[PDB]
Curated annotation (Swiss-Prot):
UniProt entry tagged with the keyword Isomerase: yes
Protein known as: Peptidylprolyl isomerase domain and WD repeat-containing protein 1
Domain PPIase cyclophilin-type residue range list: 8-163
Example of a GO biological process term: protein folding
Functional summary from the UniProt entry: PPIase that catalyzes the cis-trans isomerization of proline imidic peptide bonds in oligopeptides and may therefore assist protein folding. May be involved in pre-mRNA splicing.
Cellular component terms (Gene Ontology): catalytic step 2 spliceosome; nuclear body; nucleoplasm
Recorded superkingdom: Eukaryota
Organism annotation: Homo sapiens
């Protein structure tokens, strides 16, 4: 491999208003995606973000500074490529993936599933998996939301994210 320093890591802890979510990351398979996530995290970019879209029995979504689903961008200043990999699947719960609004439109928003979601394979970049705090993800997924918007009545937020 080429020499030089990197900004990726293979683990992080997302410290939320309802507890800690420990995430293993996949920087070998998804280097751009893990770098984006790690650099935003260390920079404090996700600090105070809400989980603005929560769908019981599906997934919890966050990472938009505006909280609307329309906002956020990559550490490069816009959108970046999908990093699909055949070994990385939404075949188990608590998979960490990029949100996006179409192919190659990754910004800053991401989600964590609470069940297998195989229909998202090769549509959303899988870049991590929860290793501790699965119960936190589950509990977040069960907060009361506005049925029309899937937005929780009481905010659930990221405090900060510690990258190992």
């Amino acid at each position: 491999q080429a020499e030089g320093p990197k900004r990726v890591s293979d683990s992080a802890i997302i410290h939320t208003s309802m507890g800690d979510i420990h995430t293993k990351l996949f920087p070998v398979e998804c280097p751009k995606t893990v770098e984006n996530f790690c650099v935003h995290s260390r920079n404090g970019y996700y600090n105070g973000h809400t989980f603005h879209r929560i769908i019981k029995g599906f997934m919890i979504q966050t990472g938009d500074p505006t909280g609307t689903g329309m906002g956020g961008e990559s550490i490069w200043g816009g959108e970046f490529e999908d990093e699909f990999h055949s070994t990385l699947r939404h075949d188990r719960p608590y998979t960490l993936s990029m949100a996006n609004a179409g192919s190659n439109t990754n910004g800053s928003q991401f989600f964590i599933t609470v069940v297998p979601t195989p229909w998202l394979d090769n549509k959303h970049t899988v870049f991590g998996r929860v290793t501790k705090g699965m119960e936190v993800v589950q509990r977040i997924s069960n907060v009361k939301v506005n049925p029309k918007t899937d937005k929780p009545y009481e905010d659930v937020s990221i405090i900060n994210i510690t990258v190992k």
